[PDB]
Amino acid sequence: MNIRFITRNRHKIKEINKILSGTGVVVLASEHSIDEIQTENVHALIKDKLLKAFKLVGRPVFVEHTGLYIESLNGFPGGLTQIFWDKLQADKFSQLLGTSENPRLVAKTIIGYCDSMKIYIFEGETQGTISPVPKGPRDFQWDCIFIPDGESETFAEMGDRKNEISMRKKAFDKFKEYLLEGGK
Amino acid sequence: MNIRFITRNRHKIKEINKILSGTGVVVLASEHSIDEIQTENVHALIKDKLLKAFKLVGRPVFVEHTGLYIESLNGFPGGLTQIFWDKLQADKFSQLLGTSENPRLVAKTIIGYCDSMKIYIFEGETQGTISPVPKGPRDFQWDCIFIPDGESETFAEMGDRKNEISMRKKAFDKFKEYLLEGGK
Amino acid sequence: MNIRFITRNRHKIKEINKILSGTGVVVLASEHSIDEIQTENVHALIKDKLLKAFKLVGRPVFVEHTGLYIESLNGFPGGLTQIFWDKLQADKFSQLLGTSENPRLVAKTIIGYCDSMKIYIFEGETQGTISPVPKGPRDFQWDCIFIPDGESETFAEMGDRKNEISMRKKAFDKFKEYLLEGGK
Amino acid sequence: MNIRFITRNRHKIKEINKILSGTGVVVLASEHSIDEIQTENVHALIKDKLLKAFKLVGRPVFVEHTGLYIESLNGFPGGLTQIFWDKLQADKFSQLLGTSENPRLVAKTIIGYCDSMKIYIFEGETQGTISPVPKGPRDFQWDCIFIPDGESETFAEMGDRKNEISMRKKAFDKFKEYLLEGGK
Amino acid sequence: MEQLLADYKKGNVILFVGAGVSMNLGLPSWSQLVDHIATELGYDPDIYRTFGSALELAEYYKLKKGKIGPLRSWMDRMWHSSDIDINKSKVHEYIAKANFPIIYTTNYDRWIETALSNYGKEYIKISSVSDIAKIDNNKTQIIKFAGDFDDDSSIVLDETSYFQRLEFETPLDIKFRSDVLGKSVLFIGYSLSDINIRLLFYKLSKLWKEQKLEEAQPKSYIFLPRPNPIQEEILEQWRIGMISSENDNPGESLEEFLKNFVLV
Amino acid sequence: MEQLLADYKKGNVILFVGAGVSMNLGLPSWSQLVDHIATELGYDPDIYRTFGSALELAEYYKLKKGKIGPLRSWMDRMWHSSDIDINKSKVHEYIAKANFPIIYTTNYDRWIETALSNYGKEYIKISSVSDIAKIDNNKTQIIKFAGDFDDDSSIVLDETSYFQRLEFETPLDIKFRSDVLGKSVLFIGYSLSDINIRLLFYKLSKLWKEQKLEEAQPKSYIFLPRPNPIQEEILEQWRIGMISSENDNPGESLEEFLKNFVLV
Amino acid sequence: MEQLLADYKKGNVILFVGAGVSMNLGLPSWSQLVDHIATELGYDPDIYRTFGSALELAEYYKLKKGKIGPLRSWMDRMWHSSDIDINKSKVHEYIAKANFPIIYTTNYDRWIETALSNYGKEYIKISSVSDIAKIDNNKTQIIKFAGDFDDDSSIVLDETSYFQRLEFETPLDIKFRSDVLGKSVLFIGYSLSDINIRLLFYKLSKLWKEQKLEEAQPKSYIFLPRPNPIQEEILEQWRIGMISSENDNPGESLEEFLKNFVLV
Amino acid sequence: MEQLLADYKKGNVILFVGAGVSMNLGLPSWSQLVDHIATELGYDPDIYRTFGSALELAEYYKLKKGKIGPLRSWMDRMWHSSDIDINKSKVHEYIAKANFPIIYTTNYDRWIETALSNYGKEYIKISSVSDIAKIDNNKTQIIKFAGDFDDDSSIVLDETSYFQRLEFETPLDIKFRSDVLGKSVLFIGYSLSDINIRLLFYKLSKLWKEQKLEEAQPKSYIFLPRPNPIQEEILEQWRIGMISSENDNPGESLEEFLKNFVLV
Ligand SMILES: NC(=O)c1ccc[n+]([C@@H]2O[C@H](COP(=O)([O-])OP(=O)(O)OC[C@H]3O[C@@H](n4cnc5c(N)ncnc54)[C@H](O)[C@@H]3O)[C@@H](O)[C@H]2O)c1
Ligand SMILES: NC(=O)c1ccc[n+]([C@@H]2O[C@H](COP(=O)([O-])OP(=O)(O)OC[C@H]3O[C@@H](n4cnc5c(N)ncnc54)[C@H](O)[C@@H]3O)[C@@H](O)[C@H]2O)c1
Ligand SMILES: O=c1nc[nH]c2c1ncn2[C@H]1C[C@H](O)[C@@H](COP(=O)(O)OP(=O)(O)OP(=O)(O)O)O1
Ligand SMILES: O=c1nc[nH]c2c1ncn2[C@H]1C[C@H](O)[C@@H](COP(=O)(O)OP(=O)(O)OP(=O)(O)O)O1
Ligand SMILES: O=c1nc[nH]c2c1ncn2[C@H]1C[C@H](O)[C@@H](COP(=O)(O)OP(=O)(O)OP(=O)(O)O)O1
Ligand SMILES: O=c1nc[nH]c2c1ncn2[C@H]1C[C@H](O)[C@@H](COP(=O)(O)OP(=O)(O)OP(=O)(O)O)O1
């Protein structure tokens, strides 16, 4: 299956490429930096972002969105995580969220896919914790700040075994299950 | 002069009615809740919001976006203040931003006005301080948390003289000035 | 049967009325004085005269031409008898043709009939002798000069039995026969 | 000037050729034998004959009709002279009209000329006497029977000076005069 | 025939008067007309005819002289002389007494209206688009399909003219190609040697057949004084029906046919 | 505007109603219509739109399902439902109580007639040549310019139909193009996104000018609700005069624009 | 005349042949045709020709006999007989030697092609659209504007037909109306008794005038044999010349006019 | 698809180039155009694009300024600037090296001929009825179907213009409706949002079917870079077949397709 991908993140392309490596499907990724909308439900956000991507391409194209949901911050980001990270980085994140009463937070990836006829929504989630100190490499955003539940290593520090339990892996497992199950 | 206004805040209608009492112009406000976009520049944001308002009305209509800019948060809100205040309210604002080492913040409103031919942009700003405690009535969002420069009372407790030094008053003074001199 | 007749002789109308009394057919005579042509054959003459009569009427119409043929004149009249009799009358006929060595002459009528589809030709003849003196009434042209074969009275003095042995009676007997058997 | 002529007499062509030698005009004669009409006035006769000649040619064409008028016959020929001469010839002319008490007769030709716009009529006449015996050659019809006024020789024996006093010469002198002065 | 009288009663017949009617009056006629041009141009009455139809002969005069004006002036002053009395034409009386709500015509004169007035009736004369705007459903309409003597740019008196007026694009055609949708026409005073009729009807017919509702197309007619075999056949394909007579007096025959309509 | 009011009493205004008048009643709209086709075809409402106009997104349904029957059934049953009350629509009331002699429409329903009957009037529906043959000058004429649901050979609901119908050769065309000569049309309910109105008037006008009487061509109109600068100049080149209002409630607007006619 | 010769040099002349050419050969005339129809119907020659034109007196045949087959057969067998020798007709020789790139005709026979082959030349026949698809720019094109005997749905031999073929919607028309946009036509063999020749040019000329380049539209011609005052004027109105002669012999006349073109 | 290549071989295909081709060059686009009209007239780029399509927005400019001249000048001087080098557009190279006998276009610029000359070739430009008289069967013909910048009375750049040019009555229309009789057209650089191609083809087709020789109609094509489901359905109704690609670089896709033709 030849599916296209529109995104802004370049490392997202390499993650989706090594996750889907050897499956049979291929991804023709392109960089456009589609702006998102400020809504609470991620279904409408992934719907209109996939609408803008299909208006850009016109071929079968899927669209990914990733969000952090901080339980201390009453579930504030998720949909709006990009501006949060791009204004704070890892310096002004862990000193005021990792040292609070509730370090618990959940990270969700939602995939919106268009088969040129319909819109299909697939999602996955992992629970986790904010580290009090940023730890590991700092080349893939909040990977050095996010320890998963039941682990003591940040997602940048585990390395290539991040893509076996992460929320991108479950979301693209459901996407892979749909893509080889047929066009149902 | 007859100009229209699209918003979702019912008290924005009240303040723009009572600022513009006696200047000559009147506003015919309607409630629609246009969804804004997530960008850094407020010019493209107010252009997109005024474009949606003009597509909905089709007559001379202005729209207004109001933003806080907290210096301890490196100016994180502004464009995106509504989801912030609607999520963490007044309880989870003063206890972790009013107690900060840098309590400086500036409040800005931008006004996008369309005369059905062109797009005109007017703005105002007021430097201020975040209170360590919500003080005043809580019927008009963050007026009970904003200490203006030169005073010790919040905008909620200050009363009807709130819209004499406010950034909304400066922006609407420039808007009223352009409406009274004419279509320049 | 209703057939029309075009002529210039008013007594031709009278004779054709009183020959055809009781046979079933009637004639609607009109006076026009069609000008004949000068030819030797009476077939082309009666075809031209019937053509002019059919162009004038447009309905089933018959026409009739009557000719004398004097043997001392090598059969000079016939086709052209009308101008002859209208010029030299009865005075300059008997004194130089009735006194001739050969007083034989034959009288013929030809009848051209058009049924608005075809042209039908009927004829009769009677051998006779020219009188040396006009004898009888002079109201019907040369009947007072024609001695028929077998008698010594002219056609004028003979009376209403003129049209029982006459060549007009034989030609109209053939015409009446074809009109009663039908469109053969 | 180039004028055409339609006739049936081949010697009419010869005489009109040799009368019109040297005047300037020439004739292109053709033989068709137009059938004339049986009327008293020669004007309607020559109009009908010129109409048939112009319908056959379509160019400037003249036609000519030649008539005898015997005073003992009350002017019976003229218009109808051709059938008369072709039937009784020269044998049955002199023995019963040349021996009459009144041997006066006048010969006339009428010329109907069409210039493809109008109809022009020219005529001539010569008083004369009928011979009691055919005298002269018999190649040109009744020239051997016509004694002109003032002479004792027939037109046949007179020779080439026949067309100097003849009625054809007077009529063609008027025709030649109108052709030389022009289209009056 | 009977069918026609059926329609006359309901109110679904249109009348198309032609030049034949103008005989009783004693007006001139084309013969005299063309004879006229001939004398004027220098020819002879008969020699002129040998060259063309009739419209063509007239388009010559025009070109020679320069324009139609001169002739229109003769026709108008002559055809409308003061020696013609309308009261003595029975044909007109009947037309003015029957009940036809729309009367079309191809004459250029003005007698049909003069008649309608003399026996007390009202009408609206339509020779242009301006008039199509005054029509009242309470008066009779008289349409001059071939022009009148009150304009020179309408009178159809020549080939070039009898041409353009063949694509039916004039304002006064569109009105007639929409008045026959749902109605029958009764030609009178006409002749069968003109083929506008054959393109009008040959074209109304084909339309019903497209819808395939042909059975409904109203039915036309065409009283001709003298009967003719061949033509009846052809004028039937196009959907028109003849109604001849036997009186050889053409005029008399016409006065007759129009009594089955005046019937008080 | 005043000029219009002048004629609404002479009987020279023709009303051309369109979908906007309906909607208010509570009926569906192409929104729902085009969506239905989508679901019935496996597509998603939005995605389907990104492919063609709307007519096109219906030339397609048919082609797949072979014919237009399946759809005409849904529309007929859904629109003419029994949860719709006519006495609750003023727009439809004022229209019934005015005095317009002829009424053309491009809607497929049957609500206008229903109203005229409800408030006590009489009319003759015209959707084929047969009807044209029944017109009574004493009742109203309601012409369906785009077909009704009582036939499928004449329903303009697709491209290939908004085509052979751009040559104005159908019988119902010939009628319009004879009615507009001498009268003016007041368009209402319409949205200017259709070029049928721009090839009719563009073609009528150019006719008057050839006739050299432009100053006579009757005046038209077109009540739009919100005004457009650009599309007001273009629509004068031809010859239509826009009218408009300030009340922003669409329905409110239309209703009052009409009381200016109902009085009396 | 001289002007014409100019164009023939380059290649801007088209030839249009008619029946006059096919009479020198010996073929039956049209007279005999109509007469035949008469005998075969009980009428007599003369009386039959008093009811209609000629085309009309041939639509009657068919109608009675139900179809045109019975005639096409007499005609085909009689004309294309074997007592006719093509090498004895100069007119047909020259035509085969000249240099005319395109040749239209209104005859139904096949003698022109026969000659072109007898004197060694190549050509293509076009009587339908399929043929148009085979045109070679290196051979002559012989177009049959009025049908051949190899099909009866085309032969134009009756009124009804010589009618519907006056709207120019047939494929073979569209071609002639694009061939004459840029070239001139030399009519020969014809006789002014048509309106096709008149509504063709009358309609081309007017086009050039709108284009405001009248001075460019080329010049047809029309060798007639005898001359006509009137027609020259009427036909002068639409760029049609005229080139009569003086030799009365019709055949003689035509042949000479042609040698002016063969000239090796 | 293979069928098309079948014909380039024999010699029966016509190229109809559109605006898409003019992209590699770097010319302005339609967008920039309307942006200009907007700034000039006093509006804002986007606010302007809300009141109409394009053949409306431009007609406004013209109605306002007074005439089209002021724009033609900007366009001509801008589109033909000296910063564009033809030698660097592969698309043009292929077009100039292929062997298409007749090339039609809807662009207004002059680059297609500049190309033919630069790679050594010959041509005749036809924008008027005068040039149709110079055509030589040994050079390529280039027809400007929508006008050039060498006249303002032709350039079709506004509604009213894109109107009259839909009855196909101009000289250049009569020439195209006789060039497709027997030929397939290969559209390129076009976009499916114009109904000229749906009236020409929806009308060429009906003819074959009327003759019933349908099978004969040559076959068209329309390479569209991106593919669409619905359109294929409709465009098949009138023999037109799509030929999409997969390369998402539209430009590249186009250059490709034109190699199957250049093939020495
Ligand atoms: N109610 C609806 O939404 C709807 C939609 C489709 C059909 N209809 C019927 O049609 C009417 C409404 O149609 P609509 O206004 O919704 O149509 P639309 O909005 O679907 O029209 C699309 C656009 O295509 C245009 N157009 C026409 N020819 C074109 C061409 N050659 N090039 C480019 N554009 C062209 C017009 O500018 C029009 O704006 C009603 O009368 C109804 O009966 C209803
Ligand atoms: N092969 C032949 O001999 C022959 C002869 C007759 C017809 N045709 C066909 O017809 C054409 C040639 O015809 P043609 O020139 O021999 O004459 P034609 O048979 O076409 O003549 C018809 C006559 O009708 C007349 N007419 C036209 N409009 C009229 C009107 N409104 N009222 C009365 N009369 C009117 C014309 O002026 C002409 O005299 C060619 O297309 C040919 O195929 C062939
Ligand atoms: O596995 C991850 N590990 C660490 N950080 C991550 C991850 N995945 C997303 N992120 C960050 C980057 C991204 O910018 C932001 C929100 O995601 P997001 O806004 O959708 O990415 P983007 O804007 O760069 O590309 P796109 O145009 O598809 O939205 O969270
Ligand atoms: O004078 C104010 N004093 C206190 N709080 C205020 C004030 N004015 C706006 N607010 C709140 C509500 C508003 O939602 C948010 C930011 O304003 P802002 O983001 O522009 O409003 P919004 O997103 O809901 O849409 P809109 O501008 O059309 O009303 O802070
Ligand atoms: O029974 C008759 N007994 C004595 N004389 C007769 C008779 N019938 C005719 N005639 C006279 C008059 C007629 O004019 C002339 C030759 O007859 P004829 O030449 O055919 O008459 P015509 O030339 O005046 O024309 P039409 O036949 O139409 O009456 O002898
Ligand atoms: O100079 C003449 N000397 C003696 N006889 C003449 C002469 N000229 C004519 N003739 C004879 C023949 C001619 O046929 C008849 C009356 O002349 P006429 O009736 O006009 O001749 P026609 O009927 O045969 O026809 P056309 O005049 O066209 O030749 O007397």
What does this structure look like?
The complex is a heterooctamer, with 4 copies of chain A (184 residues) and 4 copies of chain E (264 residues). Chain A is of the alpha/beta class and 184 residues long. Helix content of chain A is 33%, strand content 26%. Chain A has a 6-stranded mixed β-sheet with strand order 2-1-3-4-5-6. The radius of gyration of chain A is 16 Å and the shape is globular. Chain E contains 12 helices and 6 strands. Chain E is globular and about 55 Å long. Chain E has helices at residues 2-10, 30-41, 45-49, 55-65, 69-79, 90-97, 111-118, 159-164, 171-174, 197-211, 229-237, 250-257; strands at residues 13-17, 102-105, 123-126, 140-144, 184-188, 221-222. Chain E has a 6-stranded parallel β-sheet. Chains in contact: A-B, A-F, A-H, B-H, C-D, C-G, D-E, E-F, E-G, F-H, G-H. Chains E and F meet through helix 10 of E and helix 9 and helix 11 of F. One 2'-deoxyinosine 5'-triphosphate (Y43) binds at residues 7-9, 12, 34, 36, 64-66, 81-82, 85, 140-143 of chain D.
The chain pair forming the largest interface, with residue counts per chain, is: E-F, 23 and 23 residues
Please indicate the count of domains of chain E.
2
**Biggest pleated-sheet summary of chain A:** 6 strands, mixed
Distance between the termini of chain E: 20 Å
In CATH, the architecture of the largest domain in chain E is: 3-Layer(aba) Sandwich
DSSP summary, beta strand count of chain A: 6
CATH class of the largest domain in chain E: Alpha Beta
How many discrete domains of chain A? 1
Radius of gyration of chain E (Å): 19 Å
The second-level CATH architecture of chain A is Alpha-Beta Complex
Task: Report helical residue fraction of chain A.
Answer: 25-40%
- CATH topology title of chain A: Maf protein
Q: Give me the strand/helix succession of chain E.
A: HEHHHHHEHEEHHEHEHH
- Report the strand count of chain E: 6
Please state how the strands of the largest beta sheet of chain A are arranged side by side: 2-1-3-4-5-6
Bin the helical content of chain E: 40-55%
CATH class group of chain A: Alpha Beta
